[PDB]
Amino acid sequence: LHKEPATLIKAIDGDTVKLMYKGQPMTFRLLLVDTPETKHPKKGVEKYGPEASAFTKKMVENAKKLEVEFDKGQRTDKYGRGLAYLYADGKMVNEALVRQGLAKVAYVYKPNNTHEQHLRKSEAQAKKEKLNIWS
């Protein structure tokens, strides 16, 4: 896998960000994580939804450099969203969310599963520390 530069347009919620990528606006969905949502198609605003949104927003807005890393499988979902791991100054946003107990590790679909073991270990740590969602 390889990291490529991107520029922030707007954080949309905990799991979704709009970026300029290779000169075009594109919505990205963060691979492998499920955050509580503020949008939710059926539920609207869920517990820790605002917190997870604010966490992603701060991280992306305060970064010097953002980079996206695609996995080995499909790079877009059925909604036209890019599927990627997002890095803010070298720190993976996907991991930071899970480590803080603000996201769970999603149902995984091979072959988009390269960082799965890494994220699962962070989730186990957040669960052990009783953080946020695990409180």
Side-chain angles (χ1 to χ4, degrees):
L1 313 185
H2 166 240
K3 298 158 168 50
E4 304 164 56
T7 305
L8 180 61
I9 296 166
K10 186 168 139 50
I12 297 168
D13 73 354
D15 69 357
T16 305
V17 310
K18 195 174 268 179
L19 303 173
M20 207 81 78
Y21 173 73
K22 295 226 58 74
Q24 305 258 159
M26 181 152 65
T27 300
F28 283 74
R29 167 66 159 94
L30 299 188
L31 266 171
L32 296 194
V33 307
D34 282 341
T35 62
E37 295 172 55
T38 57
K39 270 70 194 167
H40 203 290
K42 294 261 105 289
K43 210 188 147 206
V45 173
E46 318 182 285
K47 186 156 162 60
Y48 297 103
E51 281 80 10
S53 288
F55 184 94
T56 297
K57 178 165 185 303
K58 264 42 89 197
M59 198 158 179
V60 304
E61 284 184 353
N62 292 124
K64 310 206 287 186
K65 313 195 180 169
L66 290 186
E67 293 166 295
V68 293
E69 173 184 66
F70 294 97
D71 213 325
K72 300 176 315 269
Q74 308 101 295
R75 291 169 179 27
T76 78
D77 65 20
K78 73 193 184 218
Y79 300 101
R81 303 181 286 178
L83 290 174
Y85 303 105
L86 174 68
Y87 294 84
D89 295 329
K91 307 188 218 71
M92 191 197 310
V93 180
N94 311 52
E95 193 270 341
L97 282 165
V98 174
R99 182 61 184 89
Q100 294 294 319
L102 288 170
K104 292 153 54 287
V105 181
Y107 198 87
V108 178
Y109 299 96
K110 310 193 160 235
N112 279 346
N113 76 148
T114 297
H115 299 308
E116 179 193 12
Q117 182 75 285
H118 177 69
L119 294 184
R120 287 199 185 281
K121 288 179 188 167
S122 293
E123 190 187 66
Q125 195 58 43
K127 203 178 278 81
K128 173 130 210 158
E129 297 177 3
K130 297 195 177 82
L131 296 172
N132 291 312
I133 284 282
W134 306 113
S135 191

